[PDB]
Each structure stands twice: as structure tokens, then as C-alpha cells.
Amino acid sequence: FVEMVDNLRGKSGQGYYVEMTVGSPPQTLNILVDTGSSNFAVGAAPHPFLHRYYQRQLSSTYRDLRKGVYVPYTQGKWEGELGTDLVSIPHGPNVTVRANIAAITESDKFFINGSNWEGILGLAYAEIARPDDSLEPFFDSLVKQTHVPNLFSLQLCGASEVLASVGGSMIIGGIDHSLYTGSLWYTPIRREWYYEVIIVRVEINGQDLKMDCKEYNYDKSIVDSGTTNLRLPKKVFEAAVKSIKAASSTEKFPDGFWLGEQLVCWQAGTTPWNIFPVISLYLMGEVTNQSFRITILPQQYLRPVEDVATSQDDCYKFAISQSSTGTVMGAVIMEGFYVVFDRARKRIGFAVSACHVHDEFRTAAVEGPFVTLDMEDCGYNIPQTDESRSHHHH
Ligand SMILES: N#Cc1ccc(COC(=O)[C@H]2C[C@]3(CN2)C(=O)Nc2ccccc23)cc1Br
Ligand SMILES: [Zn+2]
Secondary structure (H helix, E strand, O other), X not given: OHHHOOOEEEEOOOOXXXXXXXXXXXXXXXXXXXXXXXXXXXXXXXXXXXXXXXXXXXXXXXXEEEEEEEEEOOOOEEEEEEEEEEEEOOOOOOOOEEEEEEEEEEEEOOXXXXXXXXXXXXXXXXXXXXXOOOOOOHHHHHHHHOOOOOOEEEEEEOOOOOOOEXXXXXXXXXXXXXXXXXXXXXXXXXXXXXXXXXXXXXXXXXXXXXXXXXXXXXXXXXXXXXXXXXXXXXXXXXXXXXHHHHHOOOOOXXXXXXXXXXXXXXXXXXXXXXXXOXXXXXXXXXXXXXXXXXXXXXXXXXXXXXXXXXOOEEEEEEOEEEEOOOEEEOHHHHXXXXXXXXXXXXXXXXXXXXXXXXXXXXXXXXXXXXXXXXXXXXXXXXXXXXXXXXXXXX
């Protein structure tokens, strides 16, 4: 899998993308890797934040499906025309695939200035594809038309006039042992829509938040490469920030720091890492009553920004933020770990990433098992709307 190592790039906080080609002759585009969605969609007209876009009419292998699509996120949305075309990943498997593509014709708060990506590769399950689940997602087509094992793995690697470049690896069809150290621990996928998981416990510097564990997963917990922060439900975020504030309390930062809206700075090289606590999320294990923990450092949740006007200083953004749609284990989490999306066995694996940023006293850690007897149920059941209830699935 050496040809797939280091095949992701991006700018810190603005998404990891992989190079893809669509069409005949091949049009090259930089495509966000997003495990929180299941559509393959590409900028298909001019836009202030796009260097280039997909030109359907210039591909002899394009086919229009004569159907529109609309996807609204919490932040951002887009619409497009559905079609299929030939797609390859030059630093991926040695295959070409006919896949669904949404040509994005309009959008708002979707594309990001300076990010260098022009589309999105949705790697989650058909259940949340748009307009509905009969639009085969890309990975499904890849596995179906080729010999590629139904699994991929992501190593996202952390970081004055530009933001920091980041690099990473997306290994399509397996697991590269150079990319992690020590044990690889798996947590069941609760349901194949998002990559949904269940957190059974949260510790800040070894101290239990002591919340009803249903609160950790209200209204869901998902692993999303296409989300920058660790995002936490309102009540969880408030307790977690209270604990981190407490530990770090020799430094009094402005409100805007903790809201994720302001940098704080120390003189080059003098950041007091050791006043910030480690955060451990315990995930449901494969075995009943077992769990394992993934522990991240302040090096992951304190995200570095080089300020033009204080470029002498090491400056950081707080990259834990509030959610009203559940826990999102985003890049902040993932940059600790080599994360294995084992679709075949309906599980997600975590191991310590051979590229995670640490210091001489503490590392990100993946550790288990831990055991509870009569371990309760920590899952939440999303209220079912009449809209969702009325849909037939033939
Ligand atoms: N109908 C629907 C529907 C609603 C919500 C979701 C949630 O989608 C995510 O979380 C993806 C998309 C993401 C980050 N990851 C985002 O939220 N804004 C944004 C902006 C730019 C790039 C990636 C993203 C998925 C579906 Br499908
Ligand atoms: Zn029907």
C-alpha cells in the first residue's frame, strides 16, 4: 500500500483531500475525504473559491441521470445534477470505476477559501446518500466493480501568510502496518448510515465526567474526517470545558478562546502543554461489557495557527466545540490515531498513529480492555418523524 501512503493533503483546519480524476479525458480535481456523508459531488461551474471545476460536456464518458440533488448540512449546502462517469484515484488502487457524480451547480457556505478542494468524497453508507439510498455511494461502486476489499483506513497527520500544510494517508482496501504502533482495537458500528459508534465513558485527566453515558451519544456519535473539531453535545461540552478550564487555570484566557473563536499565544517554544489535560473517550468494545479508551493530548485539541502580527509566538485555536447533533469525532480525534473503517466486519479500529504530534511526557494512547458489569445501554434512539416513516425502501 506504499503507493497510497501520503496521498492526502490540505491546509490545517480546512479538510484533507485526495486527488481524483473524473471523465474521459481525465479531469483532475482535489476531493475532500469525508466520512460524514455518502455522496460524490464536485464543483461543476465557476465559483470564487474554486480554481477549477468538472466540465461534464468535455467528458465523452459522462452520462446525465436527468435528476437533481440537494444536500443541506448544518453549516453549508449545495445542489447539483446527477450523472455517472469514469472515476479514478491516481494515488489509490489501480482501477477505474463508473460511479455516481453530483455536478454541483450552486452552493452556499460549502467551499472554503484557500482549502484547495473542489469536491467531496462521501465515504459513509447509502442510508444517508441523497436524494435517497438508491444512489449508490462511491465506495460501494468501487467494491462492487473491482476486487477491492470492503475496507479503508485513514491516517490523518496533524500540523505566516498561509495556514499550515497537512498530510495524510487513505489506504483503500486494507491496512498499512507502517502507519501505527501497538494494538489495534475495534468498536462496533452501531448502524450503517453514518459511521456511528457508542461512547460509554469520558475522562478528563483520568477524572470521570460522571454523566449518564446516553449523554455522550445524544443524539448520536460519529467518526467524521470531514469535521475539523472534536464536537460534543451541549451538556457534555460544558462539563468537559469546565474540567479543562480547571486544569489550565494558571492561564486566564478570554471567553472567545473557549468558544473556538480566538487564538492564544505563548513565546515560541514555551507552550505549557502540561497544564492542559488529556481527554479519554471510552468506546464500546466488540465483547459485551468491554471497552477500550482512546486518549488525545492538548497537541490534538489545541490547533496551531501562525499569526502574521505575532509570528514570533506559538498561537493556538481551541478545537473542541458545541454540538446540537451529537458527538463528532473529527480530525482532532483522528489525528491521534490510525483509523480503520472495517465495513466488512461492521467495525471501526483505532491504533496510535505513527505520525501523531506528542511530546516527551505524554502520547496519544489506545488502551483496553476495560470492563463494567451490567454495563447499561448508552445509545440514543432518534425520534422518528412521519416524513422519515413514510419513505418506502424497495
Ligand atoms: N441531508 C443531509 C445531511 C445533513 C448533515 C450531514 C452531516 O454531514 C457532515 O457532517 C459532513 C458534511 C460536512 C462535514 N461532514 C458538514 O457538515 N458541512 C460541510 C461543509 C463542507 C464540507 C464538509 C461538510 C450529512 C447529510 Br448527507
Ligand atoms: Zn412502496
